[PDB]
Symmetry: C3
Subunit: 114 residues, 3 copies
Amino acid sequence: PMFIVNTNVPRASVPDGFLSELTQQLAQATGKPPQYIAVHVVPDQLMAFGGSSEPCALCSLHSIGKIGGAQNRSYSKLLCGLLAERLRISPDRVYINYYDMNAANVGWNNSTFA
Amino acid sequence: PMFIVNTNVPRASVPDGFLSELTQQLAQATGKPPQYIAVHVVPDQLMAFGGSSEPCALCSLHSIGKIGGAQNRSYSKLLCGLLAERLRISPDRVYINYYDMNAANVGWNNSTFA
Amino acid sequence: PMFIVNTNVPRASVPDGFLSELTQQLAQATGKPPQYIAVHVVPDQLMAFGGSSEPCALCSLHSIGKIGGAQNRSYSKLLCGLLAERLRISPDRVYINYYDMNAANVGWNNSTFA
């Protein structure tokens, strides 16, 4: 699985352990080993949400399976809670795009997972 | 909706009210409430288009509905127009990928839109 | 076609000509003329792969057609090979997402390809 956060929160306000915290929580959330989880945080971004420049985040979660109606409602609660406590972002200023990827469309280690 | 621009144009060339303008034009183009429109501009990028490092842009628009054949042609005219007028990027050096997202695959404020 | 690579490798480790090489190799691999190939390289990123901060990359390839089972394995061998040789990234620390785009959902030069 792959999780990306783009935010206007400055770099110095991203805690040093945030990437490892995300990795561990997403491994439990998805039921996949932490070795398979990749995380990417992009601070200091020029963005607005509803026309306002208060702190906000635009995110995406890709995974081969473990994506769906009930699961995505649970992920949103987990991720909003993490962004609220660690980055101080209000949860109504968070978007997360979920992607259920086909194994043939994910490359890794010179091949694909198909 | 969510709109992202990645470009090699320098940060200093992005006009002050550019995020505000994108928000208002996208609300009028999609008919979506401006309170739910997010915009994101990433300048100073290392990019090439057709092998050339002249000004270019790679963009995306995600939306629940309001995506389709005729609508996407109209969005493309509007967005290339703004990129040409505001950032001086030639329209033939711009790609825009459009994504019709399922309401269950868009997370917001501890839930999804389904 | 559009190829994007995000990596934690420093900008000074990207060799001169890297974007030209990607443009030429992807033109040959996809069969499309190089005029229509776009490439985007984002170094110095804050990311982790498996909870480790060793060099890694998160990538995507978008194409109108030329996306499929055997084709995507061949792209993965080519692209992991380039990232290993030029950027010194191990292939088992690379993810590439593949997207088969519908022509009606790709804007260019004030309109769409369909």
